[PDB]
Design a protein around this ligand. Sequence first.
Ligand SMILES: NS(=O)(=O)c1ccc(NC(=O)c2n[nH]c3ccccc23)cc1
Length: 280
Amino acid sequence: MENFQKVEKIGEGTYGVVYKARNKLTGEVVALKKIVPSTAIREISLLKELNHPNIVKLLDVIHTENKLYLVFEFLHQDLKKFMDASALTGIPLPLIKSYLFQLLQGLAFCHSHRVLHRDLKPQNLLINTEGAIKLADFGLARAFVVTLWYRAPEILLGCKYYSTAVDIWSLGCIFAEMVTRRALFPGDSEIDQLFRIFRTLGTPDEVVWPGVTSMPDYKPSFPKWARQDFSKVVPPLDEDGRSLLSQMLHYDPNKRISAKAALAHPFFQDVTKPVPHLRL
Ligand SMILES: NS(=O)(=O)c1ccc(NC(=O)c2n[nH]c3ccccc23)cc1
């Protein structure tokens, strides 16, 4: 590991501290994450082959002194900071739509390889100066302070075998947040998270989500809220954007739109790739 000089700490992630670091041989600047079960080693090693331009590149996996360091390509800014910096005027819709489109490409890729993220959130969506956005920490949750805001309702209801659909749900919540400049469901506990979802989208029932009532953490005592209309939930998003968001936020994970079908949605008919103006 001595092959790296830490330049600065970027922050505490779910799986360890992330450092900006410089390779002493190569000269390259990278993100260095200090995270050992052989099972974790093999899953992580699979992730090195999972290469896509909207997926932060895992450069190296350093198992040393019984410790695990992951070396990634480095990006200069995350979507949370960019959202914060954009909050006076909001992110312009064409850049929201570009970001959403690119992230759906990323998902479509990983999902087609049966790999899910499970913990999408603004802090692991990384952006560069060329107008790209990338998913960071893909596949780590499986290979191995906690924000709940982007958690799919089937996870909160105790489903142990959830699907790629959970990422679509997270990404729908992020889409909404870019548009409105506020978190869609900022729960501060699991029940607060669930009940915020219920209050906006309606308490789910057997009609809209067959099997919901048989889920591990479902309680017949849940209060029954009525669904709100999306026009009230994410103005001033147009009809195509609301329609797509609605399909990303379907309760039933089987009805929820796939990343691949989302890419064909009419919302993306006029998609472009703007460059943001970023201050590094
Ligand atoms: N807070 S901030 O906007 O200044 C900022 C946020 C994030 C990164 N960059 C990173 O954290 C980062 N780059 N590549 C990664 C690969 C995996 C995990 C994190 C990775 C830099 C700056």
